[PDB]
Design a binder for this molecule. Structure first.
Ligand code: HEM
Ligand SMILES: O=C(N[C@@H](Cn1ccnc1)c1ccc(-c2ccc(F)cc2)cc1F)c1ccc(-c2nnc(-c3ccccc3)o2)cc1
Length: 448
């Protein structure tokens, strides 16, 4: 039919990957300018990637059903992490049941207990590691540690955290993470080759499943000897029954737990770090005042109402941090059948993408897009896609923001911070999940 315009390939069989790596946004905006089109196709190692780079057409990426646009093939490289029959490795109907089960473990009703759990871990961390009148820290490392500790304290019973503490859990997860080859998205041959990565991933997942098995057995013993019963994400998923009457296997529960941590860890840490970096910069002193005012009448011990209902401004700070520097640069689907987008047909076999980095820098949608302004609103409806939308919208958004907001309120109640450079850090685009440049994240905390 009428295909999107294709950016010229001048270096064959790499395509535009190299140019993309150098300046993701600059490159994408150059394609947009040159091809006179928000919808255009680039070439990544010989694979056509059609970018829906016009915010007016977002719904064409986000709304079509799975039969039409499917992320499953994109996620083939993560099958060893999730496990077979888990998440994108399951038929879509089955994945949806699993997602519902996960969301039910992050229901608003469970937030009643999450708030104190999170604040407990935050205080404990600050008391241990931020103990002088002032001191120097790497904010990105400290927020990452807080997020693993807080997520674990919400989601895992004490017995589990004893057998599998944050530190050990992070090691297992990092071993799985460092075994991933996202290049396999564009070079699918990799997924059929024998790779040492495969054995490491399996080692770590099996080790984790073993620990969970031993926790389940121990809990059974606790219940028999005392009436002690632990209610957590583990117990919750284990009690799940699919519509076909079968229960979730331990294999599936393990994969879901792993998948949840993989989703939640970096994104939440990065969002918290950016938010603090912005709030502490002198240019944003008005915003820091608005935050401090928002939390001023909060009890020493926050509760569900405080964080959920009484923090709209902290929430704006979080979303605008994601809006300016989205941790996920490119959302992708396999085109399963020709799809009409704007004035073009995107053909079966393409990878279709929608880029939060590109869309969040559209100047009609977000005037002066490099300026962090929590008071802004999108000027094109649906242009903010920080948490995705439609069929595959984020199910962790509320829990992620609960942690970010709780950490912001707890940190800024007791500390000020000073950046150790003139400007907030540059984003570092070399990672799967993009955050501020780590070596630029050293800051000074100052006890209030
Ligand atoms: C906290 C900051 C977070 C950001 C910025 C974020 C961002 C996103 C984005 C952009 C998508 C869309 C993916 C796509 O369209 O391909 C997404 C989907 C998803 N997110 Fe997150 N997320 C965050 C937190 C979390 C947490 C804490 C969890 C789990 C506890 C989570 C679980 C998921 C799941 C399961 C999907 C896929 C839903 C589906 O495929 O139907 N999110 N999120
Ligand atoms: O982190 C990834 N996926 C995460 C995204 N996430 C994080 C928070 N919410 C959603 C992810 C998504 C869904 C799930 C998940 C899905 C289903 C389920 F039942 C449970 C969990 C788990 C995840 F870890 C991820 C990131 C990058 C990539 C990627 N592969 N290639 C690129 C790429 C290519 C070209 C240019 C730039 C990036 O990026 C693939 C996966």
């Amino acid at each position: 039919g009428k295909l999107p315009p294709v950016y010229p390939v001048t270096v064959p069989i790499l395509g535009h990957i190299i140019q993309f790596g150098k300046s993701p946004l600059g490159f994408m905006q150059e394609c947009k300018r040159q091809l006179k089109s928000g919808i255009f196709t680039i070439n990544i190692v010989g694979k056509r990637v059609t970018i829906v780079g016009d915010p007016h057409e977002h719904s064409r990426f986000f709304l079509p059903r799975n039969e039409v646009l499917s992320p499953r093939e994109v996620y083939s490289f993560m099958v060893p992490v999730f496990g077979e029959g888990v998440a994108y490795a399951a038929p879509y109907p089955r994945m949806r049941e699993q997602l519902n089960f996960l969301a039910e473990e992050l229901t608003i009703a469970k937030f009643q207990n999450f708030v104190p759990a999170i604040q407990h871990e935050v205080r404990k961390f600050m008391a241990a590691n931020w103990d002088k009148d002032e001191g120097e820290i790497n904010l990105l490392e400290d927020c990452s540690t807080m997020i693993i500790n807080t997520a674990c304290q919400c989601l895992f019973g004490e017995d589990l955290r004893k057998r599998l503490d944050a530190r050990r859990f992070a090691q297992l997860l990092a071993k799985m993470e460092s075994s991933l080859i996202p290049a396999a998205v564009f070079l699918p041959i990799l997924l059929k080759l024998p790779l040492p990565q495969s054995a490491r991933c399996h080692e770590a997942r099996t080790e984790l499943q073993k620990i969970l098995s031993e926790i389940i057995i121990a809990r059974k013993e606790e219940e028999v000897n005392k009436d002690s019963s632990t209610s957590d994400l583990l117990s919750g998923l284990l009690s799940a029954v699919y519509r076909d009457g079968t229960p979730m296997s331990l294999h599936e529960v393990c994969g879901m737990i792993v998948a949840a941590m993989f989703a939640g860890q970096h994104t939440s840490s990065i969002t918290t770090t950016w938010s603090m970096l912005h709030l502490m910069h002198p240019a944003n002193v008005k915003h820091l005042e608005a935050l401090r005012k928002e939390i001023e009448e909060f009890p020493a011990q926050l509760n569900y109402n405080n964080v959920m209902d009484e923090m709209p401004f902290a929430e704006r700070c979080a979303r605008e941090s994601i809006r300016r520097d989205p941790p996920l640069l490119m959302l992708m689907r396999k085109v399963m059948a020709d799809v009409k987008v704007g004035s073009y047909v995107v053909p079966k076999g393409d990878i279709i993408a929608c880029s939060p980095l590109l869309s969040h820098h559209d100047e009609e949608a977000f005037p002066e897009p490099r300026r962090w302004d929590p008071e802004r609103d999108e000027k094109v409806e649906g242009a903010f896609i920080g948490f995705g939308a439609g069929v595959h919208k984020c199910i962790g958004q509320k829990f992620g923001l609960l942690q970010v907001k709780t950490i912001l309120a707890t940190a800024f109640r007791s500390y000020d911070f000073q950046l150790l450079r003139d400007e907030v850090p540059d984003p570092d685009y070399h990672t799967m999940v993009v955050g501020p440049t780590a070596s630029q994240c050293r800051v000074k905390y100052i006890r209030r």
